[PDB]
């Protein structure tokens, strides 16, 4: 089997991407944030505290003939941005882009933090990291990808995120028309439960490439590119007037600037992030100070190749017995 679904930016900045997902019988379609940095499929639901729901589409298990309470199971998750959610668990039929999993754990939110409430466009998350991170207790549950894997033509999914445009998540096949050149594959460590890999270096604009190992995670659920303070300082030093602002919470730059590109290494290959991808616009409405798309990972504890990086590439998440990551230009 295979699946193919379009993923669409939630706003004009590409702050996140939503992908329609069919849950239950008859289908209830929710728009979920596919997140390769976590491993819980959770939804706004009929059980979510009413005051914490503001415009989201909810899953109502009582209206699904295939829903079953997973008795005794609870979940609770906290994300790197400080947001959180928790609740109980149902199993139900879940389909993405024509690919169907029966008996998928659908984690129903009883509580969500304010950031989720305030984002009316995201009806929940669909985790695509390794199932070892799943938070369901006392019986840990499998991700949608893990459940689908044996049925897939090939044990892979791909992320093809657009810049200010829709893109595609494919399951079970590599679309050879979706990228240019060849795909370069690189080793993955699953020790922390992430799609963790080591970039071979970077360049700023037309500058020379610096060969250096940068361990990080491929995370579709993180908006920006978070790299070591040395790397980030070298980037922003090439932008007149750019500075790190403690008040704002990172690097800002004059909105009048033209940003240089940023290149990252994948083995001997190179992925170029155009300068425009690094512009996240005014810090507040009408401001002439703009927020940077490359930020320091210092104090996160991990480097994160988020959407800013991933959307410059066609990315293969290879879930074979020895997982790997592939990157191609597009």
Radius of gyration of the chain (CA): 20
Distance CA 1, CA 175 (A): 14
Q: Count the residues in the chain.
A: 330
The single residue listed with the structure tokens 């985790």 is 127
**Backbone phi, then psi, for 133, in 5-degree steps?**
-90, -5
Where, residue-wise, is CATH 2.40.70.10 in the chain? 5-174, 175-330
CATH class of 5-174: mainly beta
Which residue, among 45, 159, 161, has the nearest Cα to 92 in the 3D structure? 45
Q: What CATH fold (topology level) applies to the domain 175-330?
A: Cathepsin D, subunit A; domain 1 (2.40.70)
Q: Among 95, 108, 199, 296, which one carries the catalytic annotation?
A: 199
95 a catalytic residue: no
Whether 199 is a known active-site residue: answer yes
Name, in order, each residue with C-beta under 8 angstroms of 210's C-beta and a sequence gap of 6 or more: 201, 202, 203, 234
Closest by CA position to 132, among listed 289, 330, 323: 323
* Active-site choice (14, 35, 88, 92): 35
Contact between 172 and 153 under an 8 Å Cβ cutoff? The reply is: yes
What is the number of alpha carbons within 13 Å of residue 63 lying toward its C-beta? 11
Q: What are phi and psi of 158, to 5 degrees?
A: -125, 145
Q: Return the HEC string of the chain.
A: CCEEEEEEECCCCCCCEEEEEEECCCCEEEEEEEECCCCCEEECECCCCHHHCCCCCCECHHHCCCCEEEEEEEEEEECCCCCEEEEEEEEEEEEECCEEEEEEEEEEEEEECHHHHCCCCCCEEEECCCHHHCCCECCCCCCHHHHHHHHCCCCEEEEECCCCCCEEEEECCCCCCCCCCCCEEEECECCCCCCEEEEEEEEECCCCCEEEEEEEEECCCCCCEEECHHHHHHHHCCCCCCEEECCCCEEEEECCCCCCCEEEEECCEEEEECHHHHEEEECCCCCCEEEECEEECCCCCCEEECHHHHCCCEEEEECCCCCEEEEECC
Q: What is the 3-state secondary structure (H, E, C) of 14-64?
A: CCCEEEEEEECCCCEEEEEEEECCCCCEEECECCCCHHHCCCCCCECHHHC
């Amino acid at each position: 089997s295979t699946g193919s679904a379009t993923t669409t930016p939630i706003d004009s900045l590409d702050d996140a991407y939503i992908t329609p997902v069919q849950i239950g019988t008859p289908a209830q379609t929710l728009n979920l944030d596919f997140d390769t940095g976590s491993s819980d499929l959770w939804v706004f639901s009929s059980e979510t505290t009413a005051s914490e729901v503001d415009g989201q589409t909810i899953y109502t298990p009582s209206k699904s003939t295939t829903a079953k309470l997973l008795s005794g199971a609870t979940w609770s998750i906290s994300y790197g941005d400080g947001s959180s959610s928790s609740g109980d668990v149902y199993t139900d039929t879940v389909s993405v882009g024509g690919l169907t999993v029966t008996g998928q754990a659908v984690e129903s939110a009883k509580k969500v933090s304010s950031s989720f409430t305030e984002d009316s466009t995201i009806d929940g998350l669909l985790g695509l990291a390794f199932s070892t991170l799943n938070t369901v207790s006392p019986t840990q549950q499998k991700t949608f990808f893990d459940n689908a894997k044996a049925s897939l033509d090939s044990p892979v999914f791909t992320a093809d995120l657009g810049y200010h445009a829709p893109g595609t998540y494919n399951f079970g096949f590599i679309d050879t028309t979706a990228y240019t050149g060849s795909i370069t594959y690189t080793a993955v460590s699953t020790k922390q439960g992430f799609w963790e890999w080591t970039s071979t270096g970077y360049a700023v604009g037309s500058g020379t490439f610096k060969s250096t190992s940068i361990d990080g995670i491929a995370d579709t659920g993180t908006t920006l590119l978070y790299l070591p303070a040395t790397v980030v300082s070298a980037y922003w030093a090439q932008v007149s007037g750019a500075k790190s602002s403690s008040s704002v919470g990172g690097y800002v730059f004059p909105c009048s600037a033209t940003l240089p590109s940023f290149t990252f290494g994948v083995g001997s290959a190179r992925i170029v992030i155009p300068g425009d991808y690094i512009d996240f616009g005014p810090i507040s409405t009408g401001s002439s100070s703009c927020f940077g798309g490359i930020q320091s990972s210092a104090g996160i504890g991990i480097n994160i190749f988020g959407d800013v990086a991933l959307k410059a590439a066609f990315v293969v998440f290879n879930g074979a017995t020895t997982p790997t990551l592939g990157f191609a230009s597009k």
